[PDB]
Design an enzyme around this catalytic site. Structure first.
Site, PDB file in Angstrom:
ATOM      1  CD  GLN A   1      38.886   9.689 -10.002  1.00 49.69           C
ATOM      2  OE1 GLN A   1      37.752   9.932  -9.582  1.00 49.69           O
ATOM      3  NE2 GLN A   1      39.649   8.525  -9.739  1.00 49.69           N
TER       4      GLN A   1
ATOM      5  CB  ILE B   1      23.776  16.072   0.510  1.00 51.12           C
ATOM      6  CG1 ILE B   1      24.573  16.905   1.050  1.00 51.12           C
ATOM      7  CG2 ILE B   1      22.869  16.567  -0.490  1.00 51.12           C
ATOM      8  CD1 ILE B   1      24.984  18.447   0.427  1.00 51.12           C
TER       9      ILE B   1
ATOM     10  CE  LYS C   1      36.268  14.591   3.748  1.00 49.35           C
ATOM     11  NZ  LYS C   1      36.186  15.443   2.700  1.00 49.35           N
TER      12      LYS C   1
ATOM     13  CB  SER D   1      28.630  16.123  -7.728  1.00 48.87           C
ATOM     14  OG  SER D   1      28.986  14.801  -8.210  1.00 48.87           O
ATOM     15  CB  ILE D   2      28.832  18.685  -2.923  1.00 54.41           C
ATOM     16  CG1 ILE D   2      27.770  17.915  -1.779  1.00 54.41           C
ATOM     17  CG2 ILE D   2      29.283  20.045  -2.199  1.00 54.41           C
ATOM     18  CD1 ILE D   2      28.595  17.667  -0.516  1.00 54.41           C
TER      19      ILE D   2
ATOM     20  CB  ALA E   1      38.860   5.961   2.236  1.00 54.46           C
TER      21      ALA E   1
ATOM     22  N   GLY F   1      35.680  17.866  -9.145  1.00 49.13           N
ATOM     23  CA  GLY F   1      34.794  16.828  -8.464  1.00 49.13           C
ATOM     24  C   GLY F   1      33.241  16.834  -8.999  1.00 49.13           C
TER      25      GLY F   1
ATOM     26  CB  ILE G   1      38.833  15.950  -4.546  1.00 46.66           C
ATOM     27  CG1 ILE G   1      38.792  16.153  -6.244  1.00 46.66           C
ATOM     28  CG2 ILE G   1      40.079  14.654  -4.598  1.00 46.66           C
ATOM     29  CD1 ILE G   1      40.000  16.677  -6.577  1.00 46.66           C
TER      30      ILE G   1
ATOM     31  CE1 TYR H   1      32.978  10.421   5.962  1.00 48.50           C
ATOM     32  CE2 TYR H   1      34.645  11.367   7.570  1.00 48.50           C
ATOM     33  CZ  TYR H   1      34.010  11.519   6.409  1.00 48.50           C
ATOM     34  OH  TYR H   1      34.354  12.514   5.382  1.00 48.50           O
TER      35      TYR H   1
HETATM   36  N1  LIG Z   1      27.975  13.902   0.344  1.00 46.79           N
HETATM   37  C1  LIG Z   1      27.962  14.387   1.324  1.00 46.79           C
HETATM   38  O1  LIG Z   1      26.834  14.416   2.227  1.00 46.79           O
HETATM   39  C2  LIG Z   1      29.211  15.252   1.918  1.00 46.79           C
HETATM   40  C3  LIG Z   1      30.134  15.398   1.441  1.00 46.79           C
HETATM   41  N2  LIG Z   1      31.375  15.664   1.485  1.00 46.79           N
HETATM   42  C4  LIG Z   1      32.673  15.721   1.077  1.00 46.79           C
HETATM   43  O2  LIG Z   1      32.549  16.526  -0.359  1.00 46.79           O
HETATM   44  C5  LIG Z   1      33.421  15.949  -1.114  1.00 46.79           C
HETATM   45  C6  LIG Z   1      32.658  15.861  -2.542  1.00 46.79           C
HETATM   46  O3  LIG Z   1      31.947  14.579  -2.446  1.00 46.79           O
HETATM   47  P1  LIG Z   1      30.374  14.417  -3.219  1.00 46.79           P
HETATM   48  O4  LIG Z   1      30.127  15.876  -3.912  1.00 46.79           O
HETATM   49  O5  LIG Z   1      29.313  14.273  -2.241  1.00 46.79           O
HETATM   50  O6  LIG Z   1      30.723  12.940  -3.837  1.00 46.79           O
HETATM   51  P2  LIG Z   1      31.335  12.829  -5.192  1.00 46.79           P
HETATM   52  O7  LIG Z   1      30.358  13.511  -6.234  1.00 46.79           O
HETATM   53  O8  LIG Z   1      31.305  11.230  -5.512  1.00 46.79           O
HETATM   54  O9  LIG Z   1      32.607  13.487  -5.314  1.00 46.79           O
HETATM   55  C7  LIG Z   1      33.892  12.942  -5.272  1.00 46.79           C
HETATM   56  C8  LIG Z   1      34.713  13.402  -6.245  1.00 46.79           C
HETATM   57  O10 LIG Z   1      36.154  13.024  -6.175  1.00 46.79           O
HETATM   58  C9  LIG Z   1      36.858  12.601  -7.314  1.00 46.79           C
HETATM   59  N3  LIG Z   1      37.934  12.011  -7.233  1.00 46.79           N
HETATM   60  C10 LIG Z   1      38.267  10.923  -6.316  1.00 46.79           C
HETATM   61  N4  LIG Z   1      39.237  10.412  -6.455  1.00 46.79           N
HETATM   62  C11 LIG Z   1      40.137  11.244  -7.370  1.00 46.79           C
HETATM   63  C12 LIG Z   1      39.188  12.391  -7.475  1.00 46.79           C
HETATM   64  N5  LIG Z   1      39.585  13.372  -8.581  1.00 46.79           N
HETATM   65  C13 LIG Z   1      40.794  13.232  -8.901  1.00 46.79           C
HETATM   66  N6  LIG Z   1      41.792  12.353  -8.335  1.00 46.79           N
HETATM   67  C14 LIG Z   1      41.481  11.224  -7.638  1.00 46.79           C
HETATM   68  N7  LIG Z   1      42.207  10.178  -7.476  1.00 46.79           N
HETATM   69  C15 LIG Z   1      35.701  11.936  -8.029  1.00 46.79           C
HETATM   70  O11 LIG Z   1      36.051  12.094  -9.343  1.00 46.79           O
HETATM   71  C16 LIG Z   1      34.436  12.828  -7.802  1.00 46.79           C
HETATM   72  O12 LIG Z   1      34.094  13.709  -8.560  1.00 46.79           O
HETATM   73  C17 LIG Z   1      34.207  14.887  -0.608  1.00 46.79           C
HETATM   74  O13 LIG Z   1      35.359  15.113  -0.318  1.00 46.79           O
HETATM   75  C18 LIG Z   1      33.158  14.623   0.480  1.00 46.79           C
HETATM   76  O14 LIG Z   1      33.669  13.683   1.629  1.00 46.79           O
HETATM   77  B1  LIG Z   1      33.213  12.271   1.835  1.00 46.79           B
HETATM   78  O15 LIG Z   1      34.115  11.849   2.958  1.00 46.79           O
HETATM   79  C19 LIG Z   1      31.755  12.381   2.511  1.00 46.79           C
HETATM   80  C20 LIG Z   1      30.606  11.756   1.901  1.00 46.79           C
HETATM   81  C21 LIG Z   1      29.590  11.598   2.287  1.00 46.79           C
HETATM   82  C22 LIG Z   1      29.248  12.251   3.692  1.00 46.79           C
HETATM   83  C23 LIG Z   1      30.146  12.969   4.551  1.00 46.79           C
HETATM   84  C24 LIG Z   1      31.426  12.893   3.612  1.00 46.79           C
HETATM   85  C25 LIG Z   1      30.948  11.192   0.455  1.00 46.79           C
HETATM   86  N8  LIG Z   1      31.884  11.151   0.155  1.00 46.79           N
HETATM   87  N9  LIG Z   1      33.201  11.667   0.413  1.00 46.79           N
HETATM   88  C26 LIG Z   1      34.579  11.674  -0.324  1.00 46.79           C
HETATM   89  N10 LIG Z   1      34.675  11.109  -1.310  1.00 46.79           N
HETATM   90  S1  LIG Z   1      36.106  12.064   0.474  1.00 46.79           S
HETATM   91  C27 LIG Z   1      31.310  16.614   2.837  1.00 46.79           C
HETATM   92  C28 LIG Z   1      30.254  16.636   3.731  1.00 46.79           C
HETATM   93  C29 LIG Z   1      29.043  16.025   3.187  1.00 46.79           C
END
Ligand SMILES: [N]C(=O)C1=[C][N+]([C]2O[C]([C]OP(=O)([O-])OP([O])(=O)O[C][C]3O[C](N4[C]=NC5=C4N=[C]N=C5[N])[C]([O])[C]3[O])[C]([O])[C]2O[B@@]2([O])C3=C([C]=[C][C]=[C]3)[C]=NN2C([N])=S)=[C][C]=[C]1
Ligand SMILES: [N]C(=O)C1=[C][N+]([C]2O[C]([C]OP(=O)([O-])OP([O])(=O)O[C][C]3O[C](N4[C]=NC5=C4N=[C]N=C5[N])[C]([O])[C]3[O])[C]([O])[C]2O[B@@]2([O])C3=C([C]=[C][C]=[C]3)[C]=NN2C([N])=S)=[C][C]=[C]1
Ligand SMILES: [N]C(=O)C1=[C][N+]([C]2O[C]([C]OP(=O)([O-])OP([O])(=O)O[C][C]3O[C](N4[C]=NC5=C4N=[C]N=C5[N])[C]([O])[C]3[O])[C]([O])[C]2O[B@@]2([O])C3=C([C]=[C][C]=[C]3)[C]=NN2C([N])=S)=[C][C]=[C]1
Ligand SMILES: [N]C(=O)C1=[C][N+]([C]2O[C]([C]OP(=O)([O-])OP([O])(=O)O[C][C]3O[C](N4[C]=NC5=C4N=[C]N=C5[N])[C]([O])[C]3[O])[C]([O])[C]2O[B@@]2([O])C3=C([C]=[C][C]=[C]3)[C]=NN2C([N])=S)=[C][C]=[C]1
Lengths: 239, 239, 239, 239
Positions: free
Chosen positions: D39, D191, D162, D18-19, D94, D12, D91, D155
């Site tokens: 990916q 975030i 989730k 990116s987290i 929707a 991811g 990862i 959401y």
């Molecule tokens: N942001 C915030 O505040 C949050 C988040 N969360 C969760 O964690 C995870 C991760 O995300 P981030 O770091 O934030 O974003 P990015 O950078 O855009 O990442 C995504 C990833 O995935 C991958 N893929 C897709 N599709 C596929 C893949 N690989 C392989 N194969 C396939 N087919 C791409 O490449 C990238 O690297 C997630 O799980 C999240 O969750 B959620 O639902 C949410 C948001 C916002 C707020 C809340 C929730 C956004 N987004 N998302 C999704 N996507 S599932 C947790 C807490 C917070």
């Protein structure tokens, strides 16, 4: 009784042991007019006979795997109930290999897909297809189980499908509330002991009476709730 | 109705706005024979008049701060109901200074002690004093609030007392289940909007109907449960 | 270590087996400067012995049943640490006959009072008394148990006190958050082996390691939380 | 660092925001040897750039929609790491029109299918494919969100996926625990800044720091847990 005036669709009757049969009996006892669906040709006759015993002759085919089957069923229902007051969703399935042994080894992409589709997606699928047909004051009901909240051996991917279903209850409650529709779940205990506070397993009569309540105006204040009808089992530990 | 045959003691009636008044009305409507307590000389007449309107003349003093007051009340009740089918506990208190401003600055040892004593301990205090008087199939009911589960501004130490009360429900359910007694709570929404799924606040009628259900044999499968009667408020976020 | 530059007060060290001991050890390992309290003169020497091994000669009497004792302890502490970075509360008590047998039979008004005062009120009593001493970035930690959430036989009134405690975590976190203080609990497993996902009982080391994290700036994103350190016991059922 | 001697796969990483990036950074800081997946070819170079900065040249294509892609990724990894110590799953997906407007109107069977397959099934698909490669003391980590527990506008179906994900954590923890593997999730805040107890939004650093702890032997007592790293947002109400 407390459901007079109400028209409720009941799914998932497959036998006298079915939770949905407990529910239908409770609701008929409380004055509801009932309608019934059956999955397939195998179940049609049984359901027709149960329906006749509960004063109904609305018995309609519905296989929730198919969007067309659902739409067609609600078109047929509309010829006789252009509006109605909600439904009881007592349906789910996972392929047999899913529900035995180590969860991680048992689960497959296809098993997960089917479990979630039939056991969770179908609740909102039915809601979508009958949305404009629901009166203000309508209630929807589904059946869940503790495996949604705890990891239970063998219950496996159905636990995940049930967790999805319980979230679906909340999201549906939130979406449809402004049009006067409530959506709840019963998380029933297993139906046939030493560890349950009430010292017995619940019966389909217990489940049925709670279901009747949750679909009635008596529960006007309750929405997006998973009510535990398991005799207190889930709130005890090391009993 | 669904409470015929049942004798229920209702506490906590102080006015027509009281949740316990909503509950008493619902239960009378459903065929229950009712008894009433009043805290003090100030409330006696009001409660006598409400009780007469609901076909009862069992109106007894009970201040749950005192063990002797509770025992005496149940001795008086026993002269007329040697056995009965449960009670509605709709009681709590914290000194006024406890319930305004920063929780940490507001709370004191004495405020905490009183809040917990009156609002949590009293539920089990009543259960202990009437234990041998309860029929198989008896149900006990208390009232809680979301502040037990979330930190709500100003609600302060009452949140802790309510959390204690909800645990008390579980422990009491577990202890008394084997003698045929169920114990639940309603967590009611605030009684008089845009964020609640059902788009309104619940009324004492909503609360009352749920209470009537939970004290009836219709809820035989439900014990140690906190049922949310808040219109779905607690299950939504960022609405 | 990840606690370098931190001064943390640790309550509840009574022996080398104490959870508070495992906590102090892990914190010292990670670079924290520690101070210790002890309940009574019976324990003064023994606790000086432990503090010694952990680089500390800040050892102070504190009986949390008394507001004056807490006040005078934090005054003494203020002479070595005018500012510090939080504390670990690992304190609780119910009179012994509260903790045996049927809950409804065992519980008394006085037993309830003491359990809540010592195991729950004391946490906030401590926070109130050192509030002005806490640095930005401070963390408070307490120890809870699954009995707060589930009815466990014999745990009885301590279950209610721990539920009050966990609510206290939430209300404290909410009130003190804005000035830069976090407040959390660990719900520890017993220090069961067969039904725990990790197939062992957790150790004072496992607990101490989680405690150290939760009082460090690594857990900067976590407040108001009950972290289960029980090897997954509470999320499993019927194993 | 407290991850020294650990080999952790991180999925991811898509950018420096990116987290998963914040997670990789914190883990590398703490002495972990890292590997990365990407990916598609669109991201191959960019992810090699990040891996470079973090002492790694193990950079592997993996599309979790395909069982063969996951299998071939772990085969490649097996050439550098015949054994390793777990992975971070960060990862989910929707289709876009699932995530806008009224839930019941937006959700489709296909949108539901994909959301659950990619955001929930993939976690266990990964565990199944590397199960025999995990050392004793391994930890798996995924990322959830409060939408699993509450109905959040827009959401929509991701809330259900989730919820399925967090159940997956529990069932995985239960199944893999006995062979010495832990499985947990972090429910991260977005975030909101105004109603969070800590009065700020959490950062990828806060999240990364908690992730690093939960994949280290310091969290040895924690399995099957959803840890909220949202500054206490979910425990507050009406602030
Ligand atoms: N942001 C915030 O505040 C949050 C988040 N969360 C969760 O964690 C995870 C991760 O995300 P981030 O770091 O934030 O974003 P990015 O950078 O855009 O990442 C995504 C990833 O995935 C991958 N893929 C897709 N599709 C596929 C893949 N690989 C392989 N194969 C396939 N087919 C791409 O490449 C990238 O690297 C997630 O799980 C999240 O969750 B959620 O639902 C949410 C948001 C916002 C707020 C809340 C929730 C956004 N987004 N998302 C999704 N996507 S599932 C947790 C807490 C917070
Ligand atoms: N039983 C008990 O104990 C319980 C249950 N639960 C739940 O609920 C519901 C219902 O169930 P019951 O009644 O039991 O069963 P039955 O009878 O078999 O039924 C089912 C139904 O469904 C239907 N379907 C299927 N598929 C389909 C359908 N429809 C349409 N379409 C389609 N495709 C059939 O036909 C019938 O009728 C359910 O949901 C349940 O759940 B579970 O998971 C469970 C059980 C048991 C135990 C536990 C759980 C069983 N089963 N399941 C399923 N199936 S999912 C709850 C609680 C309790
Ligand atoms: N309201 C609303 O919204 C709610 C409520 N909640 C609960 O529930 C209960 C009941 O309340 P109410 O009805 O509302 O009020 P009142 O009328 O004033 O009543 C109370 C009672 O109690 C009694 N007491 C006292 N102290 C005592 C007694 N008795 C005996 N002894 C003694 N010592 C008096 O007399 C009267 O009658 C309750 O519990 C409630 O809660 B809370 O916390 C709340 C409120 C509001 C809101 C929320 C909450 C008020 N109050 N509170 C108290 N008090 S604790 C629930 C939900 C809702
Ligand atoms: N153990 C186990 O497993 C557990 C526990 N938990 C809790 O945590 C805390 C602590 O404890 P430990 O460490 O374990 O023990 P010790 O050592 O004995 O400690 C205690 C302390 O406290 C103090 N104090 C008392 N009182 C007082 C004081 N201070 C001051 N003032 C006053 N007044 C002494 O000195 C010592 O140091 C606790 O909290 C606990 O809880 B519980 O409840 C429990 C147990 C067991 C199991 C479960 C629970 C025991 N105990 N406890 C009490 N005590 S509260 C948690 C989890 C686990």
């Amino acid at each position: 009784g407390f459901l007079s005036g109400k028209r409720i669709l009941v799914t998932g009757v497959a036998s006298k042991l079915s939770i949905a049969y407990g529910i239908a009996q409770a609701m008929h006892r409380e004055g509801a007019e009932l309608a019934f669906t059956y999955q397939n040709d195998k179940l049609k006759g049984r359901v027709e006979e149960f329906a006749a015993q509960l004063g109904s002759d609305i018995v309609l085919q519905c296989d929730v795997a198919e969007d067309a089957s659902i739409d067609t069923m609600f078109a047929e229902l509309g010829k006789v109930w252009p509006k109605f007051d909600g439904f009881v969703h007592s349906i789910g399935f996972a392929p047999g290999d899913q529900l035995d042994g180590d969860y991680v080894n048992a689960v497959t992409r296809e098993g997960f897909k089917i479990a979630h589709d039939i056991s969770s997606y179908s609740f909102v699928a039915m809601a979508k297809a009958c949305r404009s047909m629901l009166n203000p004051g309508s209630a929807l009901l589904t059946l869940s189980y503790l495996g949604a909240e705890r990891a239970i051996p063998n219950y496996n991917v159905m636990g995940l499908a049930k967790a999805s279903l319980e979230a679906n209850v909340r999201y549906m409650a939130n979406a449809m509330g402004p049009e006067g529709v409530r959506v709840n779940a019963i998380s029933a205990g297993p139906i046939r002991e030493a560890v349950t506070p009430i010292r017995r397993t619940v019966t389909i009569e217990d489940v049925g009476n709670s279901a009747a309540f949750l679909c009635s105006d008596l529960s006007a204040g309750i929405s997006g709730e998973v009510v535990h009808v398991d005799g207190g089992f889930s709130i005890a530990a090391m009993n």
